[PDB]
Design a protein around this nucleic acid. Sequence first.
RNA 1: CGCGACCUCAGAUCAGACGUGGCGACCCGCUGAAUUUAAGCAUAUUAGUCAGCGGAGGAAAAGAAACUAACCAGGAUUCCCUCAGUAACGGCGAGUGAACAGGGAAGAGCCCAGCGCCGAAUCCCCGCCCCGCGGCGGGGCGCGGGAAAUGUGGCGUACGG
Lengths: 203, 50, 118, 105, 86, 122
Amino acid sequence: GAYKYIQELWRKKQSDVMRFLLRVRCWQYRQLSALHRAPRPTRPDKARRLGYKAKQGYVIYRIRVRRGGRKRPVPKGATYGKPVHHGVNQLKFARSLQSVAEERAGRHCGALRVLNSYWVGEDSTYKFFEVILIDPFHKAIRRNPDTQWITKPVHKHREMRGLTSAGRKSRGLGKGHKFHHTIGGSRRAAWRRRNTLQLHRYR
Amino acid sequence: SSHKTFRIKRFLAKKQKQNRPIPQWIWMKTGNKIRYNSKRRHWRRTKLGL
Amino acid sequence: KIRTSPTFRRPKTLRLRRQPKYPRKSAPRRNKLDHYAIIKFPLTTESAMKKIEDNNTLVFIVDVKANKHQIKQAVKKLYDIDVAKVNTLIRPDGEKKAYVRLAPDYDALDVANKIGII
Amino acid sequence: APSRNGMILKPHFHKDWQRRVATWFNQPARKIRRRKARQARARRIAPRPAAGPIRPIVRCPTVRYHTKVRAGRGFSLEELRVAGIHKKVARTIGISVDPRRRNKS
Amino acid sequence: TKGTSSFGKRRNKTHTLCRRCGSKAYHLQKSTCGKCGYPAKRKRKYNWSAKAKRRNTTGTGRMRHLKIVYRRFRHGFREGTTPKPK
Amino acid sequence: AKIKARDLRGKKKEELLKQLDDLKVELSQLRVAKVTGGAASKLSKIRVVRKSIARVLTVINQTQKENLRKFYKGKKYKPLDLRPKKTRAMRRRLNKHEESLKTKKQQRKERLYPLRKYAVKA
RNA sequence: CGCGACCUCAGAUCAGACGUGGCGACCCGCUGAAUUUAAGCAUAUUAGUCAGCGGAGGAAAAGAAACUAACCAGGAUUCCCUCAGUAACGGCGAGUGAACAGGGAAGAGCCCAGCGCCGAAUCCCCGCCCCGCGGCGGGGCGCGGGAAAUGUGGCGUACGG
C-alpha cells in the first residue's frame, strides 16, 4: 500500500523534497487564523495511525501555537520571595506545546471530543498541529460499536484532564523503576498515599 | 428622591408593606411563640441600605 | 465583466426562511392578561366616590402590566361602556391605579351601581 | 532539647499531617461488605468454584524466596499447548491464562 | 476636616442592586458586581472565604426545580404513567 | 354546585370556556364585595371560586395536551413539550438499542467461545 | 468570453443536533507561595502544600509491560500489611525518603493503523410499507440524495497472522 511510502517519506524531513513542502505549508499556515478548520488531514497516514477514519463525524482543526518557554507573569520581575524563586525568564511549562494545542482546539469546539493531534510544521515562532475531533452525536459515530466509547460522558474534554496521547506524556506515568513517583493513579495519588497516616483501630 | 426608577419604586413598595405590626389573632394559635414583629424598620433609625 | 470599484464586497447570497419540521413548543401559550386579569377591583375611597360624581370617572386597581390601551378595551368589554380617556399611576404600595373617564353619554354614577360600588 | 541519654528521633510530622489522617472506623463495615459481596458472587456462579479459576504452580524469584511455591497469575501458553487446550477455550472452563509467562525449565 | 465635616458630602452611590445576585454591590462606574461579577458568565466564588460560600450555595434558595428532581429520582424518573384509576 | 373534575372531562371544549368565564365573572363581583365591606359568607366563597377556576383550567390544559401527544404519536419529530423530560444527563445517553450493538468480530467470539457452566469435584 | 467539473473559502432566523452555567466532600490537569524549622540566614524545610485556573464522574485516574529481576526466576492496574523510617537525598545540618520481592482484597481482558485479500462488499439522510412507537428502533421497498478510492466495511495485531 501507499501509506507505507508516505510514512517513510515523512521520515525524511531534511531531504530537499520535504524541506520544500514544509516551508511552503508553514508559509501558508502562517497567513490564516490561529485556529481554523481544515477540510481534510494534511497527513492522511498519520491521521489513520492516530484513530482518524474518513467518515462523517471526524473533524480536523489545524491550530497555531506560539513557540518558546513560559515567563512568570509577575509585574516587572518582582517575585517577592526567597531567591530560589526569583526566576522569571528560563522557566518551562510543564505541558508540551502540542498539549496546549489540543486544549485550545477543544476549548473552542466544546461540542466535539479531542481524539489526537500531530505535527504538521513549524518555524521560529510557531508550531502547527492538526487536532482530530469527533462529533459524539453524529449517528455515524453513535451507532458504530468500535467508536461509541468516545460518546460516554466520562470522556468529556479529554484534553483538559490530560488524557490524550500528547497530554499523557507530561504526566510522567508508565511502568518501571523510572516512574516511581506516579505509582497509583497519578503524581497526586502517590503523594497522598505516601503522606497519609494509616491510623488503624488497634494501632 | 422624586426621580425614581421602576426597580427602586417597586423595591420601596415591598419594604413598606412589611413594616406593619403582626395581626392580633396570631398569638392565639397553638404553637405560637411570636410576641411582636422584630423586623420593624423605622425610617429615621434604620436606613434601608441603598 | 469588470471591477469598477477597487473594493471587494461580500456578494449578496440567497437566504431562506424557517421551515421547521416541528413547532418548538406544542401549543401557543394562553394569554394570562385577559380582561378579567387586568381589572382587579374598583376603589371605594372617599376620594374615589368624589371622583365619580364630579368628573364622571371610575377608579380601578388594574394589573401593573396593563397599558392604557388594554385598560380602555377591558372596561369597554367588561361593563359595555365607552371611555373618553384613561389616566394611570402606580401607587406607592405597588399596584397600578387607573382613572377611567367615561364618555359623556354614560353616567358613571349609575354604572357604579351596576358593578356594586357606591 | 535533648535530655541526658536517648535516641536521635526523626518524626516525620513537619507537614500538615493532621489534614490527611486516615482512620479505620469503617474497617468492620468493610469486612462485612466484602463478605456479602463474596457470597453474592458465589451464588451468581453457583455450580462453579467460589475461588475462581485454577492458578499454576510458580516459583518465587529473588533468592530469599526461591525455595517456596506460589499460585501464579495463569498458565503459560506452552503449558496449555502440551495439555491440549486451546488458549481461547481455557477461560471458558475456568483455567487462568496469561500469555506473558515463559518456561525456562 | 477629614472626619465629621467630610461625611457631609456623601450623596453619590457607587453601588446599586445587582440583577443577578440581588446584592447591593453592582459598581456603577465599573459596571461589574463586586459580589458575583455579574457581566462575567461565571459566578464569583473563592475558597479563601468559606463563610461567604455557604451564604450562597445550592441549599440556601428555594431549589424550586431541584427539590423536584430529588423526588422524581426515588422512582427512576418515571414519565408518561399515571396511577391506575378507581 | 361543587365543581368536580370528574364532571368536566366529558364535556366539549367551547362549553368549558363558557363555564370558565362564568366563574371569572363571579370572582370579579366577589372581589368587589371584598372592598365594599361584604358579608363574611361571601368573602369565604372567593377561595371556592379561585380553586374552581383552577380546576376547569386544569381540565382544559390536560385534555388539550393529550390531544396533542395523540396527534404526535407516530411522528419522528415532536415539540419539546412532548419529549420525555428526565435529567438532561440521561437524555444524552445512548439508546436502548445502540448500547446493545456488538461488532461482527465480538459477536463471533460469543458464538465460538461461550462461557461454560462447570463444577470441580472434591 | 460562455459553460461545467473540482479544490479552497464564504453567507444564511437554511433541516436536524450538540456545547455554555451550577455544585465541587471525593477525582484529573496546571499554576503555586510565605509564615515556619534550621535557635541567625541565603540552599534546604515548610511544599508540589494553601490560595489561583480549568475539567469530570458516581466514582475518577490507572491498566493489559519499550516491566521487575539476575532467581530453579516472576507476569496488567488499583488497594491493604510488610518492605522501612530502610537504599538514597541533605549548609551530609535541620531534615527528607521510595521501590522490588513476600502475604492478602479483587481479578478480565481486548481493539485499531499498518501488511495484505475481497467488484465499497461500508455509512448517513430523505420518501413509501410493516412492527413497536415517553431511550424513534427493526425489517422491507426506492435508476432517491449524499459521504467514501486523499480509503468505508469484513478478515486480522505481535499470545504471531
